[PDB]
Paper text:
Here we use the evolution of a new essential subunit in the protein complex of the CO2-fixing enzyme Rubisco to understand the genetic and structural mechanisms that have maintained this interactions’ essentiality for over 2 billion years of evolution. Modern-day Form I Rubiscos assemble into a complex of eight catalytic large subunits (LSUs) and eight non-catalytic, accessory small subunits (SSUs, L8S8 complex). Even though more ancestral forms of Rubisco exist and are functional without the SSU, all known Form I Rubiscos are strictly dependent on a SSU for solubility and activity. In prior work, we used ancestral sequence reconstruction to resurrect ancestral Rubiscos that existed before and after the SSU first appeared (named AncL and AncLS, respectively).
We noticed that helix α4 (aa 261–274), which faces Rubisco’s central pore, was heavily substituted from AncL to AncLS and that three sites within that region changed to amino acids that are well conserved in Form I Rubiscos (R269W, E271R, and L273N). Introducing these substitutions into AncL+7 yielded a highly soluble Rubisco variant (AncL+7 REL) that exhibited ~90% decreased activity without AncSSU in our assays. Addition of AncSSU almost entirely recovered the activity of AncL+7 REL. The three substitutions (R269W, E271R, and L273N, abbreviated as REL) are localized in proximity to Rubisco’s dimer-dimer interface. Indeed, instead of forming an octamer, the AncL+7-based triple mutant AncL+7 REL was dimeric in the absence of AncSSU, as determined by mass photometry (MP). The addition of AncSSU recovered octamerization and led to the formation of canonical L8S8 complexes. This indicates that binding of AncSSU can compensate for the detrimental effect of these substitutions by holding together these weaker octamers. Because AncSSU bridges adjacent Rubisco dimers, it can provide extra stability to the inter-dimer interface. This, in turn, allows the dimer-dimer interface between LSU dimers to degrade through the accumulation of destabilizing substitutions, which are compensated by the SSU at the cost of dependence. In addition, we also noticed that AncL+7 REL (as well as all other constructs that form dimers instead of octamers without AncSSU) were drastically destabilized towards thermal denaturation (~30 °C), which was partially recovered by AncSSU addition.
Residue numbers in the entry:
A (entry chain A): 5 to 454
B (entry chain E), E (entry chain F), G (entry chain F): 1 to 99
C (entry chain B): 5 to 455
D (entry chain G): 1 to 102
F (entry chain B): 93 to 275
The structure:
């Protein structure tokens, strides 16, 4: 009663005459087929097994309208396949569903030996089913009363091992020395040497004390990351009871469903949400396989994070300058045109969703500030962990050095100076009035990353 | 008492303040002047000196208003602001005069 | 007051004199250093930046006991660095915490061009802080009243696009034809053409009907995967209201914190929990960089899944025979000795945690059944999606073919026949009493994947 | 026991049934045949007689399958269905044969 | 009415049953016999014929008990079980006689 | 053999029935080695010595306390007068007697209210942080948690429980509640 | 205003202070100095004088820093601390100078 048997995926799932609709979700995949498998069949397999298809024809295909629902590869350029997915394929508001289709099984087929999702065009009609950041850059700056410069932060170190009381001592020194924020390390959750309730309590004493002493509003990114959603929400509740402006979630290790739970809680309780991308380099680093960070950044803005780490380019963790410029635009602008020089494969309209602060962190110190300001502009956080507490005179002096560095470079940029050409000179000028900065420059002047 | 942007640098000269106003104007942003005798972190709404200077064409016009605000309110902190109506957000704010 | 400045990571974090404790968590990392960076320094960087250290010395290091708390690379062998993490570094019961340390930042360092987490030794004292499977193999067989053979299942197809009522018609035909279970596709959650409440309602009518008509207990793995934890629990609650024995979660796409929430809810509400590993190959496909599935499988058993997919070896998705045998032992046994030939760098004692069903699924059909029984033994589910609905006579006939093939091979094995040497003959003998199997064999006899 | 569409009309002749099959086919819908000995309102899933007739081109083809179903299942209610895969819904369903004990 | 393992194969002969009993014994598991006139999915607890045969040494001894159970309960379904006390679970269960 | 995190289970096995056998005329449990893998299933102290010293800001000496006397019979207001005199004289803490719970002459709500006025007053006057070990011991777990909740509402740093007379299952309930409520 | 350990004894002399510093050093703990003009029970975080003296080898070195802190902050209370990094906690804290 039907034609049973195996068919080529290309027959149904490759259609080079197809014109994408503005409601389609588009994927750019870089494909390494198994030897002898042509790009068209490899791309069709990806399209089929992320949408409606399987490995042999089934009688029940005839009970629905596969021409309407199927994903289809509609263009191949070299090793890049462009695949269009109809809007109807996706659950509204669910990044979990996007991943379960687009990256669910298709990275593990014998027929495709490597696969990298380079970019995705999320259509406006799907974006509007997401709430975006619970706060967003502009409201966050209003809540902080801070305008006109990058914001300063810093991870407390050692990563693990400090008691709650001494942990908050480090927070107090940093914040009172001029950092706007401090943060728990991504792996500091609740442990025998530092239990979360003790930490939250003492840290918030230190935040309030530094705010009173400096006159500037302060925050600490209290890490609510935990083993279950309920436990994360319990930790968030205590942060709100203490009047923290902030909580923090490791959105990939906790995972997207728990992250969405925490975003809703943050919005309803008036807390801003720092997002740490722990685990991302497991699969966003190699050029032949995984998911490029720019796709993760899009998903992050959709669920709703107020900030996400984007790399530094110049510090201890890998990051490409051109790609990072594109990611910063994806996180902050209303509309981002395609740009092959930045690996932006598609135009991205953001449908009015609020913007996310890029966060530059990891192995950076005062000498990187001209580069960081040049790359990111004002709407970013620059975090100095080792680069604060590793100051020869400790964390208050280190914080002051970093705050002065950022302000001196902003001032110079606003006056019209080329902060890349004059970066060292601007720092040297500022160090004439700031011995903390002079000492930081001397300590780390030989410390460069490729 | 620190006063946010540029508070960790030496107090700005009039020439340095004017350059920041020039930056506000070059970017198409709206310069404004606000003042208060309570600059602490509880205070989100300093007093406006007139309205935001929507019509200002030159940095010099803004500096004249700053001097006039300084002369009327020498016991107040006075800040320069820059507003971007396209993002609906303040894009630069710093104290130009401390009492 | 202290010696500020940058020191090589190896000064503090490389200690080949260190002897691992029974309470340490151990990792085996395959490291490709940046050219010019010695293996010792690359391994110490990984050790430092997944535990206590950063890129420059800090005054506050002296406020704690880094000798007690630091991770230490204690052995480098070829391209593998062995790193020991003290028990105190970990949050009890939290896979999320394990990941945030072990795989949080270290895969992105410029100093290490590629990094592959091959295995980790979870210490018994830490394992006891985890609940394990909500049901586990033995209790699940008791709940199903099924003993002595692999269990049969199958994903409904097309993956997406069937209405709820016709989706349930396919479920009904499969279950009444002899599959023990059926499942939602991993990407079928709630969508315009098939909303989850409609699907759950009709599917459970079909499950009850097939159970009553066959006399055998049935289940459908109702996918509760959703955008938020609260939504997943709402879907689980409805499945329990309907008397489903099962729900399903995509534990990696939902993520481990929401997975733990679903495990607790499933346990408290009497549901068994199928775990689909969607997204795993994003992390685990390449041999030079990422996390091998065996590590994800350990974490799965700890949080508590009743089944997880393990690969077929012989089907459409990649999976090596030796590594799959290692993963099956890790999921099912009380104690698993090391064997680097299977990628098991450490011995793993499971501290009494319940076992997980391996699930073999993807591109398999009746001709694979002798190999599947040989690889997995009785304690596995074999899933036939296309291999059921793609039968020439449809899903009931396909289900019967698959059930007969499994039973015939189990029978022959138990009698002492060599099911590899005689696999074809066993199937041919069974097909003389089972036209459905004969037709399945004819249809797919030329369909093979490389192994 | 009423049997939904056409149940309030006189039981259909074979010629009347065939006209309804011709209507299903004319509209490009998929004819099907289902049967049961439990037709009441608890039953959403009658037994399929084969698969839906995806390849049927003539009403006579369907009528032959109806007769074959009745001969094999004379104790059962037998209904004709029409399915529209573009709406993913059944578009016509009516009982063509009732057993003697009705 | 299907009866779980081997129910989709032709009914087992005495020699086929005996080979499954030999498999149970070879693996060191405990053979048992259970029977019921209510075999459906609601029933987790068929009637024990005697106790599990902890002391059985040969498949022939089990086969004799199967014949005795059938003579006493010819109106019942009768199943052979095999229990593994190390896993605390049944490892094989199939129907040997249908009424 | 043991249920994770359950002292009650340990007792029910180890000391459940074996002390009453005719075959054993006397039996004394001297010690038990709790294995590390089982210990990790227990949370331990809600605060512990180091965090408690941090909360008190007290380092380098034994801490001072004292039970209010007479054990029973003082009104709530005069009970709190004795607390005030003790704390303002240099004790770090004071405590309810173990048998002072809620009784006709001194009901727990009255005592908790007045005692915390005295604690705050002595803290303000001496400049040293103070506490009173408010006894939440009661006939049922729910009643104990109700008393703990009021102590937290009043900003007490402490509560007290008679862990053997209340019993280990209710003690675990109070430990969890104390931890979650900052006591 | 009492100041916790030794506050109920007569104020310590320099020689008595030095003996407590010797006790801190003898036990391998880290001496530190903190000061504040707000010593009450609301304040958990007095101002650090420099950093904890991780590198101190003699009580005389600590006593010299105490004299320097007092010369710089004669209007403050000044306390000697001793920190044990193995317990991650302070093990002795007392006031050495009152304004
Ligand atoms: O754990 C760490 O190494 C950090 O605290 C940096 O410490 P330092 O400031 O002392 O370098 C941050 O988590 C990384 O920057 C995250 O990497 P990314 O931002 O690329 O996600
Ligand atoms: O979507 C699919 O392809 C499947 O439904 C198989 O369908 P078929 O039965 O028709 O092949 C399963 O999800 C895969 O087996 C999962 O891969 P794995 O088990 O390796 O995680
Ligand atoms: Mg970190
Ligand atoms: Mg699937
Ligand atoms: Mg007493």
């Amino acid at each position: 009663q039907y034609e049973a048997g195996v068919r080529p995926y290309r027959e149904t799932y490759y259609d080079p005459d197809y014109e994408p609709k503005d409601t389609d979700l588009l994927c750019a995949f870089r494909i390494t087929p198994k030897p002898g498998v042509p790009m068209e069949e490899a791309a069709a397999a990806v399209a089929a097994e992320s949408s409606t298809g399987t490995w042999t024809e089934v009688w029940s295909n005839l009970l629905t309208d596969l021409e309407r629902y199927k994903a289809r590869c509609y263009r191949i350029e070299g090793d890049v396949a462009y695949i269009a997915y109809p809007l109807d394929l996706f659950e509204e508001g669910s990044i979990v569903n996007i991943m379960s289709s687009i990256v669910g099984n298709v990275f593990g087929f014998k027929a495709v030996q490597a696969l990298r999702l380079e970019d995705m065009r999320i259509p406006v009609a799907y974006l509007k089913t997401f709430p975006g950041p619970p706060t967003g850059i502009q409201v966050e700056r209003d809540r902080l009363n801070k305008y006109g410069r990058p914001l300063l932060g810093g991870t407390i170190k050692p990563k693990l091992g400090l008691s709650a009381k001494e942990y908050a001592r480090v927070v107090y020194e940093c914040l009172r020395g001029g950092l706007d924020t401090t943060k728990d390390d991504e792996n500091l959750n609740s442990q025998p040497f530092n239990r979360w309730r003790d930490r939250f309590l003492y840290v918030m004493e230190a935040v309030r004390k530094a705010e009173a002493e400096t006159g500037e509003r302060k925050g600490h990114w209290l890490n609510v990351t935990a083993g279950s959603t309920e436990e994360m929400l319990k930790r968030a509740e205590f942060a709100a009871e203490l009047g923290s402006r902030y909580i923090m979630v490791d959105f990939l290790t906790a995972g997207f469903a728990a992250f969405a739970s925490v975003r809703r809680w943050a919005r309803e309780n008036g807390l801003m949400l720092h997002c740490h991308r722990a685990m991302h380099a497991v699969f966003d680093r190699q050029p032949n396989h995984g998911i490029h960070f720019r796709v993760l950044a899009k998903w992050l803005r959709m669920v709703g994070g107020d900030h996400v780490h984007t790399g530094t380019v110049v510090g201890k963790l890998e990051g490409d300058r051109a790609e990072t410029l594109g990611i910063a635009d994806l996180l902050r602008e209303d509309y981002v045109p395609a740009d092959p020089g930045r690996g932006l494969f598609f135009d991205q309209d953001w449908a009015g969703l609020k913007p996310v602060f890029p966060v530059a962190s990891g192995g950076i110190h005062v000498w990187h500030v001209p580069d960081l300001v040049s790359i990111f502009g004002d709407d970013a956080f620059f975090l100095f962990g080792g680069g604060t507490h590793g100051h020869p005179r400790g964390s208050r002096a280190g914080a002051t050095a970093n705050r002065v560095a950022v302000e001196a470079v902003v001032q110079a940029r606003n006056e019209g100076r080329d902060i890349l050409a004059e970066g060292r000179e601007i720092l040297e000028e500022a160090a004439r009035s700031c011995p903390e900065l002079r000492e930081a420059m001397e300590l780390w002047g030989d410390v460069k990353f490729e | 008492m620190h006063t946010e942007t540029f508070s960790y640098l030496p107090p700005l000269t009039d020439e340095e303040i004017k350059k920041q106003v020039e930056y506000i104007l070059k970017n198409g942003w709206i310069p404004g002047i606000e003042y208060t005798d309570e600059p602490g972190p509880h205070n989100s709404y300093w007093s406006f000196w007139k309205l935001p200077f929507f019509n200002a064409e030159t940095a010099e016009e803004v500096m004249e208003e700053l001097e006039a605000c300084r002369e009327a309110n020498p016991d107040c902190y006075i800040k320069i602001t820059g507003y971007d109506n396209i993002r609906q957000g303040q894009v630069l704010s710093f104290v130009a005069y401390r009492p």
